[PDB]
Structures are given as C-alpha cells and as structure tokens.
Amino acid sequence: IYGMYLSVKGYNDKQPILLKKIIEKMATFEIDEKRFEIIKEAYMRSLNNFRAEQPHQHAMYYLRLLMTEVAWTKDELKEALDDVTLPRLKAFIPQLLSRLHIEALLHGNITKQAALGIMQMVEDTLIEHAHTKPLLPSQLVRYREVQLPDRGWFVYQQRNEVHNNSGIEIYYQTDMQSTSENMFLELFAQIISEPAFNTLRTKEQLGYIVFSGPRRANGIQGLRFIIQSEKPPHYLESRVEAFLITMEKSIEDMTEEAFQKHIQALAIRRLDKPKKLSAESAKYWGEIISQQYNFDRDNTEVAYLKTLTKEDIIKFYKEMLAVDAPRRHKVSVHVLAREMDSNLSQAPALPQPEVIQNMTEFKRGLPLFPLVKPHINF
Amino acid sequence: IYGMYLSVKGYNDKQPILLKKIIEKMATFEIDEKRFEIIKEAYMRSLNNFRAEQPHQHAMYYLRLLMTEVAWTKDELKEALDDVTLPRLKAFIPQLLSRLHIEALLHGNITKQAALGIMQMVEDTLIEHAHTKPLLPSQLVRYREVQLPDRGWFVYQQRNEVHNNSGIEIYYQTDMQSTSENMFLELFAQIISEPAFNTLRTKEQLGYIVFSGPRRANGIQGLRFIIQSEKPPHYLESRVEAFLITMEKSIEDMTEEAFQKHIQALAIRRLDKPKKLSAESAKYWGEIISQQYNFDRDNTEVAYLKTLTKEDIIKFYKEMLAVDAPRRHKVSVHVLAREMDSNLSQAPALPQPEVIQNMTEFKRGLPLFPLVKPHINF
C-alpha cells in the first residue's frame, strides 16, 4: 500500500545477476497485451472470489478496512478494473518509476562495499532507464490508525454468502505502541492464552477456530479475539465478555509464583534466537518497514517485563480492558452466515453498540493516531 | 488545495453565455506555449517574491503550514517548478478533468429548474469534452488539523530577510468547532477585543499592527494574537502572557451588566443582516466549503450565547487558556527581523518551549483532529 516490495533470497553467488535482470527488466517493461488481458481477467475473478473466503477472514478484512486511514475495498477495485486499459497502464509505469524512495536491507554473506555496490547498481539502472529522481521527505507519509473514543463500542456487520458459519473479531484498542504498553498487552495475552482456548472451544465449543492475542497496525495495538462459529456473533460477543470477567478473577486469585511463571514463559518465547538467516532478516525488516528501528527491542522489553507485578496488570485491565473501563476502546466485526437473520458464567450487561453504516463517515468522526517515533534520529 | 473554484457574479441576463464560454474553453484548452513560459516565468518570480512580504504575513503563513495535514511550502513548489514542462502539463489537464466532484451554490434571480438547467449544462459539457466521470465517496477526503498535546508549547522560528521588523503569531488551540466552544471563544475574544489593542499598542507601543481574535481552520478553532514589532518575538511573547493575566482579573472584577453588555455586543455583531446579494452568498458558501452546512448558525449560537455567565467563561479560561491550564494547547511562530540574533505588569514564568526543527516530523508526532460532522445527514 506504499509501493513495491522486492525480496531476493538464496546463494549469494549469482544474486547480482538475477537482481539486474529484475531491475532493468522492471525499468524497461514491454507489455505483451495478449498476456495483459489474461492476467487482468484472472485479477477480475480473483477479486470476485473473495466472496467464497472464510467468515473469520472476512472479519479480519473488514477491521483492517475500518481502522486504516486509507484503504480501498474489493468492490471499489473491481469497479475501477474495467477502467484499466493498456495505454493507461503503460502511461502509469514510468509515472510510478519517475520518483521513488528506496529503503533496503542487505543481510548475509556480503561485505560493506559489496552492499554499497549492490544498492548503487540498482539506482544507476533506474536513473538510466526510468530517469528516476528522489522523493521529497514531505511525501514519505505513512497511514495512521483510527483513534477510538473512550468507553465506546462500534459494530460493523456483513454477511458471508457462501459459508454456513459466522465470524467475529473483537478489537480492544489500547494505546500507541511503547515498551510499557506492549509488555502490558503481551503479558496479559500470555496469561489469557491457554484459558481462552480452553473456555471458548474445549468447554463451550463455540467453534473449531478460536484465536487470542495482540493486534499491531500502523504503530497502534490492542487485544483481539477471533471466532468462527454457527452461533450468532452477538452470542459470541457475550461469551467472550463473560470469559474476560472470568480471567480478571483468575488473576487476583493466582499465586505470585504462578504470575511469575507466566512472565518467564513470555520472556523465553521472545528471547528465542532465529535459526535460519531469513528468520533473522525478518525481524530487522520488521523493525524497518514499521519504521521504529528498534533493533535491540527484545532485550529492552523483556527486561521491563520482569519488573511487572500483578496489580500492574490488574490496574491495566481496569483502565483499558474491563467491561466498564474508563478507556475502553472496542470495535467489533460481525460476519453473518449464509442463512442468518438480524452451566456457563453469566455475561455482563453490554452498552448499546453504535452500528457503522458507512465506513467513510465512520473514519471522519474519529481522530487519527500519531505515528510512532523512530528509535534513531537521522 | 482541493481542486478548482469557479465564481460568476453579476447580471443574470447573459450568465449562461459566459459560463459556457468558460467551461467548454476549460474542458478544451489549447495551450499557447509562448504564453505558457511567460506565465510560468511570472510564477517563478511570484514564489521568489514571498521573501519580501511582511513579517506578520510570514507568521500566518508558517502556522497554516504547521497545523495542516498536507501543505506544500513555497520552496518545495519552485523547486518542482523547473520540472514543469509543456507536454507534462497537457497530460495533466485531462487527467485532472477525468474524474471530478462538483458542489455548487446558485443564488439570486433564478428559479429551481433554471438552476437545475445551469448545473446539468455544466456536466454535459465536461462529460463530452473531458469524458468526466464521478469520483468515489471514499476519495472525497479533506485535510484535518494537527492536534496539540495538553500543557504543551511549540515554537517555529524563521527570519524575514527583507523587513527590519519582527513578526509573531500565538495560536491557543482550544477544541473542535461546536456551538458551545465557538461562543466560548467568540465571547472571550469579544471581551479582550478592545483591551488587547489598548494594552499592547496604545500603552506599550509594541507595534502598529496588533490583532486579536478567533482562528478557524479545518473544523478546529482557537485564540490567536498577531503582532509586528521591532522588539524580539520572545519579548512580545511575555507581554501577551502578562496581558492575559490582566484580562482574567478584569473579568472577575467586572459587573454582571458589564459582562452582559459584552454579550449583547457580540450578538448584535453576528445578527447583522447582509446588505448585498454576494454578501449573503458568502455565508452560505462558507457553510458549504467548510462542509458543516449550518445555514441557521447565527440564530442557534446567539441564543446559546445569551445563556452564558461569568463563571462559564472563567471556567473556560482556567481550563483552556490560562498559563497553567490543564488543556493549554499553544504553538508560536517567530519571524525574526532582517538583523536579529538568537510601568508594566509582570509576565508569568513560561514553560520551556519545544522548538520545531522539521515540520514533517512535527506533524507525525501529534494526532490528527476529527472532521466536523455535517449538520444535515445525506
């Protein structure tokens, strides 16, 4: 959503050979229109075939559409796909390559001047065959995340026409990403990690797909639940809220050694060293595209993690996640089954949900979060 | 900054004649390149000649650049002006006219079907000569205002190379525009209206240009001071803050009939009916481009205004404007004179100001305000 992504992996022997045959082929493309309308026709069916995807996928798709400043829907794309002709496309490629900004990560069996030579070689090819010039720092803007209001609840509802199962995602937006907030969320997700699966699937049997954990997008985070079921999403709503009260009571009542047992677990899971080369490259690149550049993130935040106590988490819950928390930011996506209308702990009474009817007007009413400050000043 | 603005005024007799000779000339332009490089060369000097504008104008120019989500500077424009060639320009005009959204206000000696005929005539000309199609509702986005943090102070400083005087604007960002907040600000500005001129110019003689009043941009508002002087802006800073403590003490000590005398004044000033036709058209268009569509704004907010009392304003001051207010959002622009470095009431001790070094990184760190909800649902 910011341009193009190029990744080359493997033996470093003949990488400079393949890299050029990619770049100068990229800068000098000569479109075979026979192929063009075949690929396009495939793209047409590709966008149309999203109707047959899983209900729990439709939920994740809509939430990302809601919380992003700018995002085009599948319908809007295939609507504008008929407007895509060959001359308009080949008037676009040099226009795209006219002004670029390249941020690269070269990792492995290469020296410093080897890497500098690889990059300088890429530019000289684009500068020659595309006459590429640099972008302004002003034009390097990245999209932000929609900031939810305190004590609020929004519900976006659609219907999967193909699958006879329902889907739901419940995003509890917490705060901007920081060492304090991250380990607050990650530890809480660590503690509710097994009980979420045990309570919602093993015991209540809502559905085969039951997921719990942190959500991270555009520098902002929060706690999310994902369930695919045959029960209506509004019932899945209640059982999760009933489970969240079950969790908080399980925290106040667990031993300090039980709580510390969870801290060490999370620490071990996040200090686990990469085994493959690409495995290590992924983490660095993850700190680069997110533009936080926290390369020593794991050491810093695990050290902070071990300083947390029970009431540090409890206080975090009552403020950010509780059913009557002052800073509760909740948004839900309800994907209905193909044919749907409209022993247990008791779910709390929920506030009346604001129903999102139009996504564009939804975004306009709410503030946009800040962008996370880079760890290194340039 | 959102496209083009077309206004036709005068006798309604031969307006449809001129309007078409504008539109179809607009849709069918045939650039004389002789003229093109003359106009361009004039544009070159136009952008360069901003260096010789008044210091108080440079202040207003920078603040608008700071608080807007997207805004290109004079330097960035004339930098990209050399990249503007004739073929690139005539590849831009149909690209621009390819997809448009037209929102119009037709006011005066015309009937309903006369107005519908005027608009339908404009479209059929663009649809024919430019093949214009409609824009998506998703693409109708308008820029927001940078949201300042509580108890904060930012200072952007530059230097006017030509004028031997300094300039300063002090924006006290208050809140999003609403009936409550607007009349809070407008009444306070009404009360400090004369004393600002009397204290800062008549008595202290800081400069000939001394302005006070509300600032409105992108749906957000606040109180602003503008002073051109030969004193350094940091001294102008102190004298305004010293004046603001002088004002609050003047409010608590003024009679209820003195306060009510101010309410009626503001009411009379804002109930004043337009005398000219274009004068009335301006207000409607002002509610249209701002997309609040509050056509009955004056009656609603004056009625609310008369319900306000002294402590309604005092409480507003201590919360939003006071030197130690919890929700003080302050940003200052300091334009230095050509040659500058780095009996009175006593100015309060000011917090240490965060100096904006780069505007792009300034905006990224702060949230973006919501967009004001339209008074009418479509």
Tab-separated table of N, CA and C in Angstrom, chain A residues 39-54 58 61-62 73-82 159-163:
chain	number	residue	atom	x	y	z
A	39	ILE	N	-3.987	-11.901	-17.551
A	39	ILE	CA	-3.676	-11.587	-16.161
A	39	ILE	C	-4.785	-10.730	-15.548
A	40	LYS	N	-5.261	-9.747	-16.308
A	40	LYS	CA	-6.348	-8.883	-15.857
A	40	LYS	C	-7.623	-9.681	-15.605
A	41	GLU	N	-7.955	-10.569	-16.537
A	41	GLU	CA	-9.143	-11.406	-16.414
A	41	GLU	C	-9.031	-12.304	-15.187
A	42	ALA	N	-7.811	-12.742	-14.892
A	42	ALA	CA	-7.552	-13.533	-13.696
A	42	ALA	C	-7.733	-12.674	-12.451
A	43	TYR	N	-7.301	-11.419	-12.542
A	43	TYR	CA	-7.447	-10.468	-11.447
A	43	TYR	C	-8.923	-10.178	-11.187
A	44	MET	N	-9.712	-10.165	-12.257
A	44	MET	CA	-11.150	-9.952	-12.153
A	44	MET	C	-11.799	-11.042	-11.308
A	45	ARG	N	-11.477	-12.292	-11.622
A	45	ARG	CA	-12.014	-13.428	-10.884
A	45	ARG	C	-11.422	-13.501	-9.482
A	46	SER	N	-10.195	-13.013	-9.334
A	46	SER	CA	-9.522	-13.011	-8.039
A	46	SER	C	-10.276	-12.148	-7.034
A	47	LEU	N	-10.654	-10.951	-7.468
A	47	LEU	CA	-11.399	-10.024	-6.626
A	47	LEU	C	-12.807	-10.541	-6.353
A	48	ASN	N	-13.407	-11.173	-7.356
A	48	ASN	CA	-14.743	-11.740	-7.211
A	48	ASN	C	-14.761	-12.955	-6.289
A	49	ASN	N	-13.658	-13.699	-6.268
A	49	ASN	CA	-13.584	-14.938	-5.497
A	49	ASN	C	-13.413	-14.720	-3.998
A	50	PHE	N	-13.352	-13.462	-3.575
A	50	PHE	CA	-13.226	-13.154	-2.154
A	50	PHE	C	-14.536	-13.442	-1.425
A	51	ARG	N	-15.618	-13.564	-2.188
A	51	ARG	CA	-16.933	-13.851	-1.624
A	51	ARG	C	-16.999	-15.252	-1.025
A	52	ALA	N	-16.079	-16.117	-1.441
A	52	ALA	CA	-16.099	-17.514	-1.024
A	52	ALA	C	-15.058	-17.812	0.051
A	53	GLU	N	-14.405	-16.771	0.556
A	53	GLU	CA	-13.411	-16.947	1.608
A	53	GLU	C	-14.080	-17.177	2.959
A	54	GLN	N	-13.297	-17.651	3.923
A	54	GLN	CA	-13.804	-17.974	5.254
A	54	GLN	C	-14.387	-16.754	5.964
A	58	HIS	N	-13.179	-12.729	6.501
A	58	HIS	CA	-13.961	-11.540	6.180
A	58	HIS	C	-13.961	-10.568	7.352
A	61	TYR	N	-10.641	-8.857	7.439
A	61	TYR	CA	-10.547	-7.977	6.282
A	61	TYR	C	-11.258	-6.650	6.525
A	62	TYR	N	-12.415	-6.712	7.177
A	62	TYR	CA	-13.215	-5.519	7.431
A	62	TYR	C	-12.602	-4.629	8.507
A	73	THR	N	-11.594	-0.930	-0.940
A	73	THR	CA	-12.301	-2.199	-0.804
A	73	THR	C	-12.224	-3.024	-2.085
A	74	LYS	N	-12.544	-4.312	-1.976
A	74	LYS	CA	-12.532	-5.212	-3.127
A	74	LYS	C	-13.493	-4.732	-4.209
A	75	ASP	N	-14.673	-4.289	-3.785
A	75	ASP	CA	-15.689	-3.806	-4.712
A	75	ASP	C	-15.224	-2.563	-5.460
A	76	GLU	N	-14.598	-1.635	-4.742
A	76	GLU	CA	-14.102	-0.402	-5.348
A	76	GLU	C	-13.003	-0.682	-6.369
A	77	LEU	N	-12.265	-1.767	-6.157
A	77	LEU	CA	-11.163	-2.130	-7.040
A	77	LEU	C	-11.656	-2.745	-8.347
A	78	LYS	N	-12.513	-3.757	-8.248
A	78	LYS	CA	-13.037	-4.418	-9.440
A	78	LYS	C	-13.998	-3.504	-10.192
A	79	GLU	N	-14.498	-2.483	-9.504
A	79	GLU	CA	-15.312	-1.455	-10.139
A	79	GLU	C	-14.442	-0.604	-11.055
A	80	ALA	N	-13.228	-0.315	-10.599
A	80	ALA	CA	-12.298	0.517	-11.353
A	80	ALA	C	-11.393	-0.322	-12.249
A	81	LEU	N	-11.584	-1.637	-12.220
A	81	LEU	CA	-10.762	-2.544	-13.014
A	81	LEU	C	-11.131	-2.475	-14.493
A	82	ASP	N	-12.404	-2.212	-14.774
A	82	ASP	CA	-12.871	-2.081	-16.150
A	82	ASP	C	-12.312	-0.819	-16.801
A	159	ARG	N	-22.357	-10.108	5.750
A	159	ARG	CA	-22.814	-11.487	5.631
A	159	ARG	C	-22.036	-12.261	4.572
A	160	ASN	N	-21.453	-13.386	4.976
A	160	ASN	CA	-20.783	-14.277	4.039
A	160	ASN	C	-21.815	-15.120	3.299
A	161	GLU	N	-21.898	-14.937	1.986
A	161	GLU	CA	-22.961	-15.550	1.196
A	161	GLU	C	-22.723	-17.042	0.969
A	162	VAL	N	-21.462	-17.463	1.018
A	162	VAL	CA	-21.121	-18.865	0.798
A	162	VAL	C	-21.056	-19.862	1.953
A	163	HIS	N	-20.345	-19.493	3.013
A	163	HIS	CA	-20.166	-20.381	4.156
A	163	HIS	C	-21.341	-20.302	5.122
